[PDB]
Design a protein around this ligand. Structure first.
Ligand SMILES: *[C@@H]1O[C@H](CO)[C@@H](O[C@@H]2O[C@H](CO)[C@@H](O[C@@H]3O[C@H](CO)[C@@H](O)[C@H](O)[C@@H]3O)[C@H](O)[C@H]2NC(C)=O)[C@H](O)[C@H]1NC(C)=O
Ligand SMILES: *[C@@H]1O[C@H](CO)[C@@H](O[C@@H]2O[C@H](CO)[C@@H](O[C@@H]3O[C@H](CO)[C@@H](O)[C@H](O)[C@@H]3O)[C@H](O)[C@H]2NC(C)=O)[C@H](O)[C@H]1NC(C)=O
Ligand SMILES: *[C@@H]1O[C@H](CO)[C@@H](O[C@@H]2O[C@H](CO)[C@@H](O[C@@H]3O[C@H](CO)[C@@H](O)[C@H](O)[C@@H]3O)[C@H](O)[C@H]2NC(C)=O)[C@H](O)[C@H]1NC(C)=O
Ligand SMILES: *[C@@H]1O[C@H](CO)[C@@H](O[C@@H]2O[C@H](CO)[C@@H](O[C@@H]3O[C@H](CO)[C@@H](O)[C@H](O)[C@@H]3O)[C@H](O)[C@H]2NC(C)=O)[C@H](O)[C@H]1NC(C)=O
Ligand SMILES: *[C@@H]1O[C@H](CO)[C@@H](O[C@@H]2O[C@H](CO)[C@@H](O[C@@H]3O[C@H](CO)[C@@H](O)[C@H](O)[C@@H]3O)[C@H](O)[C@H]2NC(C)=O)[C@H](O)[C@H]1NC(C)=O
Ligand SMILES: *[C@@H]1O[C@H](CO)[C@@H](O[C@@H]2O[C@H](CO)[C@@H](O[C@@H]3O[C@H](CO)[C@@H](O)[C@H](O)[C@@H]3O)[C@H](O)[C@H]2NC(C)=O)[C@H](O)[C@H]1NC(C)=O
Ligand SMILES: *C(=O)CCCCCCCCCCCCC
Ligand SMILES: *C(=O)CCCCCCCCCCCCC
Ligand SMILES: *C(=O)CCCCCCCCCCCCC
Ligand SMILES: *[C@@H]1O[C@H](CO)[C@@H](O)[C@H](O)[C@H]1NC(C)=O
Ligand SMILES: *[C@@H]1O[C@H](CO)[C@@H](O)[C@H](O)[C@H]1NC(C)=O
Ligand SMILES: *[C@@H]1O[C@H](CO)[C@@H](O)[C@H](O)[C@H]1NC(C)=O
Ligand SMILES: *[C@@H]1O[C@H](CO)[C@@H](O)[C@H](O)[C@H]1NC(C)=O
Ligand SMILES: *[C@@H]1O[C@H](CO)[C@@H](O)[C@H](O)[C@H]1NC(C)=O
Ligand SMILES: *[C@@H]1O[C@H](CO)[C@@H](O)[C@H](O)[C@H]1NC(C)=O
Ligand SMILES: *[C@@H]1O[C@H](CO)[C@@H](O)[C@H](O)[C@H]1NC(C)=O
Ligand SMILES: *[C@@H]1O[C@H](CO)[C@@H](O)[C@H](O)[C@H]1NC(C)=O
Ligand SMILES: *[C@@H]1O[C@H](CO)[C@@H](O)[C@H](O)[C@H]1NC(C)=O
Ligand SMILES: *[C@@H]1O[C@H](CO)[C@@H](O)[C@H](O)[C@H]1NC(C)=O
Ligand SMILES: *[C@@H]1O[C@H](CO)[C@@H](O)[C@H](O)[C@H]1NC(C)=O
Ligand SMILES: *[C@@H]1O[C@H](CO)[C@@H](O)[C@H](O)[C@H]1NC(C)=O
Ligand SMILES: *[C@@H]1O[C@H](CO)[C@@H](O)[C@H](O)[C@H]1NC(C)=O
Ligand SMILES: *[C@@H]1O[C@H](CO)[C@@H](O)[C@H](O)[C@H]1NC(C)=O
Ligand SMILES: *[C@@H]1O[C@H](CO)[C@@H](O)[C@H](O)[C@H]1NC(C)=O
Lengths: 224, 187, 57, 224, 187, 57, 224, 187, 57
């Protein structure tokens, strides 16, 4: 097929100036499945079409592969290239689809999408007029990596489960405190011992007559 | 490529060019500009060289005034040169029925092959001059734009051997394919 | 309402170590909260006020 | 208006081969409000234009509805259809804007966006050369459903509130433990009773002379 | 449509075609290919049939050599046939002022209506042959591409009754509308 | 700083059962933390060291 | 350069009818770095090109700034404007690239992207036929503001840290409860005192002979 | 602009027009429609006025039948009028080699400058009438569309002073630039 | 596994007040959980059952 991958993709040796097999990250490559303003991905689409061309040619088929202006116009983005030529006319930076740079996070292998190294007056742009970009590029790379790592676990656990865990934990803490502070159980007569099991009633006595109904003062305690 | 921040690195990737051009299923016409003056267009087997100056080597009175591609058969003996000339003029934009014609030599004449177009920025042919300027700007990245507004300016295209040092750029090829309509690339 | 859908979908995300860990900690928290509250004595006061006055013992 | 809805949309009976009113999900339909590489949504736009056409025709208006190549070119995506024809030229799978398939989650009614069933050699593609797609499609459908259900509650509660709750809970636990372990209150004389209220001073005595300043040893306790 | 996974199902939706075509506010020209050879184009009321073979039924010496749509009035008595022929040739790409003309019959002749174009892949008309091949490929999904590179190949278009079994496809109609510029659909 | 904006926006998201539940649990946690700490005795030790030596009682 | 900013942008006085410097939010302006269906951003691109034009003109350069149909076609979106003219042909609402409205959150300065105020029959659309839009626009603005404020802190803290904190908290609560309930330490003889340190063995006795091995009943307690 | 909800407000922003037009590096041709009938097109220095009615002021027998822009030099003495007329006809779509010509006056005649095109919706020139209707619809936002289908309808364009009240719209200018191909804006 | 990468990346997000607060509360929770469990007596029962029978004291 063509470059509409749904998730890595490596650039073969003959495609790169260094002539070495360079695997780009799958996540970064998948970024421009809809982007129309990335010259790097336009070159990627061109090279994928060429690769399919060698596949057909060495498969010895009869495909009527017409090459015309409309085909290349359909492959690359006409609007983007026209804008690049416009930016070429007036003396402002542009890039002729040959040099790309990226910020690499060397510990986890995650890298940013390679932008285009702008040019001017038949020369490249050095760090003096370009330092304001890669700093925020690296910051956004770190932020995106953290967000992706969070979302990986995020999109595999249910919200109801964590809500249940949180409410169970808060109830656990509340009941733990309820045990801790202690709540008085029954009333002891002030200055006397525990009346249990023959315990005094509301008006300080018993209906069986053993404990006189004298309205004696009571204090609520837990133990005996 | 150097360390930026605390764990991140800055490094670049450059794409090859000779492999892409030599690897295309068809043969692509490629445009080039060498030194600061010499323009070059290479088609299938026509390695044409283009220059600009106020030297009139052709005259309407004694020449062939090509208006249609049918008459182009009276200039060169090889079909590839005819194809290249016709499609280059079509790509720059020269709709053959509403524009001034362009001049060439009879083939039986013993003075080789050459075609020339006048684009002096004067009263007449001012619109054609501006249209050709826009076409040249679109079909060449850093157009030197010789023959500034003045007395005369004529462009000449002649057949020369293809120099083995042109930077094989591809932006110009893309613009040539985009501007040229219904261009048929052989092989 | 989504709790019922959770019970329906239980044997779909149950194949995750964090999921079983979370459900186990939730269940143990609930059960020991219940047992701890029974150790507290609120229902003991319920039976106390129920027994208040009606019976000497 | 035209297909730029901001949030469902159903496909009428005469539009479908089964001739039955089929409501597609609003969330899934709203996915391609900016997508330009979905043949299903191109057909949807064509059918919406046709529907507006019958509305105008039965409204008996004088609208100068010109139908020309430019109109249809503006409606459908020229780049996508040209790419499809290109993929038709060389013998690789393509789809002629007539058959679409999707993965359906039958419990909540949520469904994926219908892709295009690729064809080849005047025949459809069977499960043998196509099984690698719907598995990841269903996995992504489940992940997207979970993420959307989480974000629904996520975008309606403040972060400051949950942060306050978390810090209050941690302080609650800390203070609960502080109660639990117990912290000694005052000093009792080793081998004696509680001196309160006439309690011994720093050097083990009293300024009133009742308790001699003998520097007697003390132990810190909570109770009396 | 079957159960995939544990709660999910796989099912498909197919869009109707006859309703969309019969429901458009205008009348659309539809292209079709029946069996493996017979090509068909139906406009407003012209149900033209197209075939390819190396049979020369028309000759430049005794015919009308149509170069402009104005001369097309000398071929058929009905304007719909003229409209269909002109716009089909415009859609495939036949800019009438730089291309070889095409041959038809005088209307007063008692031999019906027919038009034919030669596209043999030989030295002359090779570029026209390739352009017509590309146009046919773009205007028909699975082009049989008869009359392979060899001695001769001529396409003929004749008026026949419209067969009631053509698959009313719509991709070809979209390509016909896209390629054809300023095409005016009636009703 | 965003706390002040939260007080400003209070009568906007207050129409949510989870929101009132969370604010209620936060408030009850804060107040019972304060009362529980007062039951602990840190301020009791404060008044103890303040009273240390100056007064016999 | 042109309008491809990577993150505010203000509209100068001469550009606005009110003739006052109006800074639009950077976040809202950055929304249409890829949108092709926003007439407001098409006008923004046109005005940015004009601004670069005055910059070049007052810089006194020799740039061959050709102005032709293709340039303007490359600047604005041809598809969007063609769709607008199509919607103009049949009598349905459209907008002629001159009036835009937005919902503003006056407390934090956050505002929605200005849509286009649709017109009909040489008149604007009033609140009667338009009220269904701004309500959901404001609701989505509030939701987006809350989500962005959450994600700001979200993309700067690690998931492993919060997971560690949660597990440490649950272990803290469990151990606190374990202290609270109390677990018996050693066995006391029923009806007697604590045998420690000369404590009874499994069969209720001692190997030294001081405590007879009578299998006396024992009760597990914490204290002495 | 008013309070909506509880903390949110609804307010609008309107973009200026005179600044954008007066601030462009080049001079843009602007189209306008005043009252409900009078159409206006202003180029560089040609402030042309267009009206429609069934009044025939020009006749093929005694006039100049312009078919090519080269003959347009025989109508007006100023190049700006020629440029405006040619490019307006190119923008509406009048490819000069396959279409009926249009009529103008000899310059030496003492009756000013005027050009007119017949677009009556009759048997002949029906296709041209529909094409011109589509062009007028695309090049003017709210086209009055006078001279409904009936006996006759002729459009006339004459030079008049530019009125100082036209709403300087820009949608029509964008459509003029889009439809017109290879239009060169001066200054 | 990601814990080791966290230790590697520690001096990158350590410049955040919330981060140091969270790591401090986690560390104090872990250490006081350990000390509180040592106050509980599970290991005390371990040494109890180890000492059971072998020694009188
Ligand atoms: C436009 O893209 C082209 C490639 O299509 C770029 O050409 C590059 O130009 C640089 C010089 O600026 C070349 O470096 C030189 O190359 C050779 C290597 O043997 C040698 O002469 C020097 O040692 C030096 O390294 C570079 O090779 C060349 N790249 C390619 C792929 O051909 C060009 O830079 C771009 N345009 C502008 C204005 O930058
Ligand atoms: C290519 O175009 C240039 C455009 O300048 C041609 O040069 C022009 O030739 C014409 C011939 O009629 C000159 O017109 C005459 O010139 C002088 C006054 O300048 C006078 O004799 C007449 O009144 C008449 O205007 C025209 O001036 C001249 N342009 C210039 C700047 O001198 C040139 O000949 C063309 N080249 C070819 C190969 O056809
Ligand atoms: C291109 O799209 C067309 C529709 O525009 C597809 O045509 C479909 O072709 C199949 C056969 O492969 C048809 O099935 C047959 O239809 C009738 C039903 O009465 C009957 O002959 C058979 O029983 C069988 O079911 C199908 O109806 C037809 N669909 C439509 C909507 O017309 C075509 O498949 C696509 N091209 C390719 C190469 O697949
Ligand atoms: C459509 O185009 C084909 C292209 O081949 C025409 O056939 C060609 O007719 C010309 C007539 O001059 C033949 O040229 C002559 O042929 C022979 C040698 O082949 C010889 O008599 C002469 O030296 C001269 O070259 C040409 O060969 C012939 N092509 C082939 C392959 O035989 C055909 O007539 C055209 N059809 C119509 C209806 O016009
Ligand atoms: C198409 O866009 C144009 C601008 O290009 C809009 O024109 C606007 O029309 C209104 C009337 O509906 C004008 O209001 C009037 O303006 C002047 C101010 O001195 C005066 O006559 C009245 O007091 C009234 O305010 C408005 O100024 C004008 N805007 C501009 C920027 O010129 C037009 O509304 C749009 N088309 C439609 C059908 O709405
Ligand atoms: C612009 O086009 C209109 C199209 O109607 C021209 O009017 C037409 O002029 C022709 C001249 O041959 C008329 O044809 C003749 O008309 C009558 C019957 O109608 C009769 O004498 C003949 O049988 C022949 O058909 C045609 O009718 C007439 N159209 C109408 C509706 O009357 C008009 O002259 C053209 N304008 C210019 C300035 O050229
Ligand atoms: C839809 O079904 C509603 C889901 C509500 C879930 C509430 C969970 C409550 C947890 C129970 C705590 C019990 C404490 C004694
Ligand atoms: C901006 O205003 C800063 C917001 C900081 C909120 C901190 C919340 C602290 C919670 C109080 C706990 C009190 C414990 C005694
Ligand atoms: C990759 O390295 C795996 C990371 C697992 C982290 C687990 C954290 C466990 C916290 C320790 C609690 C100790 C209680 C005694
Ligand atoms: C980043 O650098 C590391 C260094 O080991 C390298 O392995 C990795 O491929 C680079 N990432 C890229 C090129 O995307
Ligand atoms: C471009 O670079 C050349 C040297 O290569 C230098 O002479 C010239 O001044 C530069 N031009 C500009 C505009 O910077
Ligand atoms: C860019 O600036 C750096 C600053 O160190 C300098 O070394 C380098 O030569 C500059 N590059 C160019 C092309 O001027
Ligand atoms: C063109 O460039 C080549 C290669 O550097 C050089 O040898 C030659 O002299 C140059 N010619 C001119 C005319 O500048
Ligand atoms: C030279 O070629 C021209 C161009 O057609 C032609 O008119 C002329 O006759 C040729 N000369 C001879 C001597 O044949
Ligand atoms: C998924 O299947 C269920 C089965 O009941 C059906 O109701 C629902 O409409 C389907 N979803 C679609 C078609 O989007
Ligand atoms: C296509 O299918 C036909 C039968 O319909 C078969 O004969 C032919 O071999 C197939 N071609 C390819 C390339 O698979
Ligand atoms: C696809 O493969 C399946 C495997 O079971 C087979 O039954 C089916 O017939 C195949 N389809 C085609 C079109 O070959
Ligand atoms: C064309 O197809 C029809 C329908 O199947 C069939 O009856 C007829 O024989 C076919 N004709 C040819 C020439 O194959
Ligand atoms: C037959 O039609 C042609 C085509 O224009 C024409 O030249 C010829 O005169 C007509 N024949 C008769 C007998 O009128
Ligand atoms: C929203 O309204 C406030 C009111 O003070 C204003 O300051 C702010 O600029 C507005 N936001 C915009 C125009 O984006
Ligand atoms: C348009 O408004 C005018 C008044 O400006 C009114 O007379 C006319 O009826 C309206 N037309 C429609 C279709 O609403
Ligand atoms: C829109 O409706 C409101 C309702 O209050 C009314 O006041 C206003 O005049 C209406 N606008 C138009 C243009 O009819
Ligand atoms: C055109 O409009 C102007 C300005 O309102 C007015 O004075 C004049 O009478 C109108 N003319 C016609 C013919 O309607
Ligand atoms: C009037 O102009 C026409 C248009 O070319 C021309 O044919 C005619 O000769 C001119 N009249 C005179 C008297 O020169």
């Amino acid at each position: 097929a063509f470059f509409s991958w749904s998730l890595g993709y490596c650039l073969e040796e003959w495609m790169l100036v260094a002539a070495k097999m360079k695997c780009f990250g799958n996540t970064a490559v998948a970024k421009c499945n809809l982007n129309h303003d990335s010259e790097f991905c336009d070159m990627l689409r061109l090279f994928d079409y060429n690769k399919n061309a060698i596949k057909t040619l060495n498969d010895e088929t009869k495909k009527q592969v017409n090459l015309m202006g409309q085909t290349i116009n359909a492959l690359i983005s006409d609007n983007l290239l026209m804008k690049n030529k416009i930016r070429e006319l007036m003396s402002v930076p542009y890039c002729n689809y040959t040099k790309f740079w990226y910020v690499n996070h060397t510990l986890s292998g995650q890298h940013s999408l390679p932008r285009c190294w702008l040019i001017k007056n038949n020369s490249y742009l050095n760090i003096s007029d370009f330092r304001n970009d890669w700093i925020l590029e690296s910051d956004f790379l770190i932020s995106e990596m953290l967000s992706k790592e969070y979302s990986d676990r995020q999109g595999k656990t249910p919200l109801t489960l964590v809500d249940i865990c949180f409410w169970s934990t808060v109830f656990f803490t509340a009941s733990l405190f309820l045990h801790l502070v202690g709540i008085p159980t029954h009333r002891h007569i002030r200055g006397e011992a525990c009346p249990l099991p023959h315990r005094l009633n509301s008006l300080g006595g018993c209906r069986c007559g053993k404990y006189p109904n004298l309205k004696k003062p009571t204090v609520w305690r837990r133990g005996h | 490529a150097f360390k930026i921040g605390l764990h991140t690195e800055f490094q670049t990737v450059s794409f090859s060019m000779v492999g892409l051009f030599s690897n295309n299923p068809h043969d692509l016409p490629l445009l080039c500009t060498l030194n600061k003056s010499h323009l070059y267009i290479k088609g299938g087997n026509a390695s044409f060289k283009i220059s600009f100056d106020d030297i009139a080597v052709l005259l309407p009175e004694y020449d062939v005034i090509i208006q249609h591609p049918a008459d182009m058969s009276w200039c060169s003996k090889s079909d590839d040169q005819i194809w290249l000339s016709q499609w280059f003029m079509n790509a720059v934009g020269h709709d053959w029925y509403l524009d001034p014609p362009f001049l060439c030599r009879n083939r039986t004449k013993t003075e080789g092959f050459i075609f020339q177009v006048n684009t002096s920025k004067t009263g007449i042919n001012e619109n054609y001059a501006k249209k050709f300027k826009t076409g040249m700007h679109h079909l060449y990245r850093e157009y030197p734009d010789s023959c500034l507004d003045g007395k005369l300016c004529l462009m000449k295209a002649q057949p020369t051997s293809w120099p083995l040092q042109c930077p094989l750029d591809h932006v110009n090829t893309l613009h040539f394919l985009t501007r040229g309509k219904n261009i048929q690339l052989p092989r | 309402g989504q709790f019922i859908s959770f019970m329906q979908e239980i044997p779909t995300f149950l194949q995750e170590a964090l999921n079983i860990a979370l459900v186990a900690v939730s269940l143990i928290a609930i059960i020991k909260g219940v047992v701890n509250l029974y150790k507290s004595g609120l229902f003991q006061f319920f039976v106390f006020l129920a027994l208040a006055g009606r019976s000497c013992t």
